[PDB]
């Protein structure tokens, strides 16, 4: 059995610019366990990206939350790229601020 | 109605012991973890009020862990011998198990399955007392565990060992397992073109996960063309939601969102732009 | 805390 | 061919009303009203095709159809305030696939002030201040409210509403300008207004 | 009526294109468009019955129109010009038969601008009863205040305690020129509540005027410094002052 991430880019409080806040990328129904996931700002990935302990859910699909600390800023644009055995290439999701 | 429930996974690599990640919960609170990744791995805390606990709980507990990565190891050479499935090629086994308590503080009811390489393969009925195997393979270990009568023994672990950590665990963290917070409601609205528009409801910050999200166009239901995300985690032990639907331009006051939580005081009722 | 039952498959 | 022959039908509440309707139709004509309440769509009242001449239809209004001079005149005995909109009167000939539509009649039925109270009144914002607008109230509908003779003071026409839960109707204007040098007494100026308008401080 | 139309409202600029949506009654088969220009009273653009086109009045090349196997309609204007700006009405009978009353939808308004620069949402104010007409008269009038938006598309309505009440209101009929011979002015539209006096006294009682504005959607480019006006509520309250 393979199952394809469910990817969702979001924040811990709703983004107020030039207030710190916590930048999440949550990667949940996939298997198996083997999986890449990156925080991006403008592009670059982000360094000290710490993530959740491995874990599944009634139904035996993994999830894993990947979050880190950040300031949103009217100029700058968070995304998350995520790579599985599921997937033709990385796939990335931008972070939207109301999705 | 509350909770404990151990969540295992490991993971045999090529060449190396496989990985062994545990994951304790109470309720949908995250309080103990144990990675086979470190030199020296530990129990180690992941809820506040575990931390009341003196050294013996984690000197012991960590010793059963690496006995269960042990297990698991010897499970996953077994289980390559029942598929016919070479040494070499990764494979996962997981494995959950708790006990469901009242309001009471008896057993509501005990849990105990276990999945191999993604598919369900062999679990413990509701009478604690019999096994359900997915496949022919899955017999093999059904007839072993029947023939050493392990049903006594995890009955026996479920019914009593179970239900009195949890006991205690929730006495131990009251003020947090027992509140319950509930979520901060809105809705946003998107202009998606000139003849439709998406009504987007957001629930955030609630715990626990169980919540209801549903549009409704003048008291009827949208079951069908509503767009649900699964419940996901705020990074510090809440939850957030949303629930959005496609509504005809011009016809947008017609719909309405209802939550329901346990921290609610009552089933709230939303709309907008 | 974690079984001290463990059972091999 | 249809003609609705007057632009504007102004009637009292309570009183019979009438907007005229002559069409130019070779032979047995198909005919029609429709009514365009503000803000609203057409909505069809009732048509002549055959049989009786007085036809009775939606909101207790009726037509009188007559071939003598080729009218199809829109009635009804007692006029509602509601009343008030555009009226259209359409024909369809055998081979129209369309209805064929007047320029259509405003209907502008006045409310019948028992108590005229007219005053001028000044609302001061619920947030910040020298934001105020000036409400002038509770005249007979025979007042009329002229537009600012100021290109900066801004004048709403007439407007009545009820207050169903008691039976009371109203007329009111509201006018409000950029300057805050503006005065409520000030106001409504290039209008004439009643002499007994009770105007506080 | 039974007749459905989508949007009400269409803001879009010269030299674009838009698609209006129709739902005829159930059972109708024939299907009727028409323009209602502020200009030129009702005018007569297509018919459709059960899918095939049938009677055609002096519809434009840059005009067409469409029934489905559902049996809905769609009216598309293309290259548009600032003539096109009118009321787009659908309007269905069970067949094509002169005896046959056509049942109108609600119209789709459209409005046809230069360019999408001058497009503005209102800003919206409440006003407080008068305690002169408190006192004098036993009754307390709100007022509401949208101003500076362009066009002048925007809907209105009181909700009090979160219910949206319909007796003591009054609207005018039409937004106001806030600049009355600039040909591109912006607009400003008011409207009133009445209430008992007891009840605006009872400082639990809430009051909340709402202007839905009629902007642009997602899909509009938009490379000007403020922020996009697109279709939005912008709103306004006060409590009950004893």
């Known amino acids: 059995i393979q199952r394809t991430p469910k990817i969702q880019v979001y924040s811990r409080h709703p983004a107020e610019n030039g207030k710190s806040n916590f930048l999440n990328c949550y990667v949940s129904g996939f298997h198996p366990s083997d999986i890449e996931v990156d925080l991006l700002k403008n592009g670059e990935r982000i360094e000290k990206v710490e993530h959740s302990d491995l874990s599944f859910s009634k139904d035996w699909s993994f999830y894993l939350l990947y979050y880190t600390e950040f300031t949103p800023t009217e100029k700058d644009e968070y995304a998350c790229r995520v790579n599985h055995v599921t997937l033709s290439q990385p796939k990335i999701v931008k972070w939207d601020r109301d999705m | 109605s509350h909770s404990m429930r151990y969540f295992y996974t490991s993971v045999s690599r090529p060449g190396g012991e496989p990985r062994f990640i545990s994951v304790g919960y109470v309720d949908d609170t995250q309080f103990v973890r144990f990675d086979s990744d470190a030199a020296s791995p530990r129990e180690e805390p992941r809820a506040p009020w575990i931390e009341q606990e003196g050294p013996e709980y984690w000197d012991r507990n960590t010793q059963i862990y690496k006995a269960q990565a042990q297990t698991d190891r010897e499970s996953l050479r077994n289980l390559r011998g029942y598929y016919n499935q070479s040494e070499a090629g990764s494979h996962t086994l997981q494995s959950m198990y708790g006990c469901d308590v009242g309001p009471d503080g008896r057993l509501l009811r005990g849990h105990d399955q276990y999945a191999y390489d993604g598919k369900d393969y062999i679990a413990l009925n509701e009478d604690l007392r019999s096994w359900t195997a997915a496949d022919t393979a899955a017999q093999i270990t059904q007839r072993k565990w029947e023939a050493a009568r392990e049903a006594e023994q995890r009955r026996a672990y479920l019914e009593g060992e179970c239900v009195e950590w949890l006991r205690r665990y929730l006495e131990n963290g009251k003020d947090k397992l027992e509140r319950a917070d509930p979520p901060k409601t809105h809705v946003t609205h998107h202009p998606i073109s000139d003849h439709e528009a998406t009504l987007r409801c957001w629930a955030l910050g609630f715990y626990p996960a169980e919540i209801t999200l549903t549009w409704q166009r003048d008291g009827e239901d949208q079951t069908q063309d509503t767009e649900l995300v699964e419940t996901r985690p705020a990074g510090d032990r809440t939850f957030q939601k949303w629930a959005a639907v496609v509504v005809p331009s011009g016809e947008e006051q017609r719909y309405t969102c209802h939550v329901q939580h346990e921290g609610l005081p009552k089933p709230l009722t939303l709309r907008w732009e | 805390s974690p079984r001290w039952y463990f059972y091999y498959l | 061919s249809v003609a609705q022959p007057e632009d504007q039908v102004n009637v009292a509440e309570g009183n019979p009303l009438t907007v005229k309707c002559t069409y130019s139709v070779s032979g047995n004509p198909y005919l029609f009203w429709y009514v365009q309440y503000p803000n609203r769509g057409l909505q069809f009242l009732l048509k002549y095709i055959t049989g009786d001449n007085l036809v009775k239809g939606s909101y207790g209004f009726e037509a009188e159809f007559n071939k003598s001079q080729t009218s199809f005149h829109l009635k009804k005995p007692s006029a509602l305030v509601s009343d008030s909109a555009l009226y259209f009167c359409?024909?369809?000939?055998?081979?129209?696939?369309?209805?064929?539509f007047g320029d259509g009649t405003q209907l502008v039925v006045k409310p019948n002030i028992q108590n005229p109270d007219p005053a001028v009144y000044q609302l001061r914002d619920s947030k910040s201040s020298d934001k105020s607008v000036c409400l002038f109230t509770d005249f007979d509908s025979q007042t009329n409210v002229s537009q600012s003779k100021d290109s900066d003071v801004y004048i709403t026409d007439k407007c009545v509403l009820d207050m169903r839960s008691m039976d009371f109707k109203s007329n009111s204007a509201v006018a409000w300008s950029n300057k805050s040098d503006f005065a409520c007494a000030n106001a409504f100026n290039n209008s004439i207004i009643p002499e007994d308008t009770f105007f506080p401080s | 009526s039974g007749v459905t139309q989508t949007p009400k409202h269409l803001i879009t600029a010269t030299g674009q294109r838009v698609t209006l949506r129709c739902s005829p009654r159930?059972?109708?088969?024939?299907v009727y468009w028409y323009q209602q220009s502020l200009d030129q009273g009702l005018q007569f653009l297509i018919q459709y019955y059960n899918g095939e086109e049938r009677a055609k009045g002096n519809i434009l090349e840059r005009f067409s129109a469409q029934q489905f196997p559902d049996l809905h309609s769609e009216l598309n204007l293309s290259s548009l010009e600032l003539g096109d700006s009118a009321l787009y009405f659908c309007?269905?009978?069970?067949?094509?038969?002169?005896?046959?009353?056509?049942?109108f939808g609600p119209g789709t308004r459209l409005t046809v601008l230069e360019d999408l620069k001058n497009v503005f949402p209102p800003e919206v104010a409440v006003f407080e009863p008068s305690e002169a007409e408190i006192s004098h008269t036993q009754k307390a009038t709100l007022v509401c205040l949208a101003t500076g938006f362009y066009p002048d598309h925007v809907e209105l309505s009181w909700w009090v305690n979160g219910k949206e009440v319909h007796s003591g209101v009054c609207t005018d009929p039409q937004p106001l020129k806030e600049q009355p011979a600039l040909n591109d002015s912006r607009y400003a539209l008011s409207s009133r509540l009445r209430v008992s006096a007891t009840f605006w006294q009872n400082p639990r009682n809430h009051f909340r005027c709402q202007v839905q504005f009629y902007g642009l959607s997602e899909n509009d480019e938009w490379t000007q410094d403020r922020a996009k006006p697109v279709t939005q509520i912008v709103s306004a309250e006060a409590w009950g002052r004893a």
């Open positions: 359409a024909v369809r000939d055998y081979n129209n696939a369309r209805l064929m």
């Open positions: 159930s059972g109708d088969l024939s």
């Open positions: 309007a269905s009978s069970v067949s094509g038969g002169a005896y046959n009353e056509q049942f």
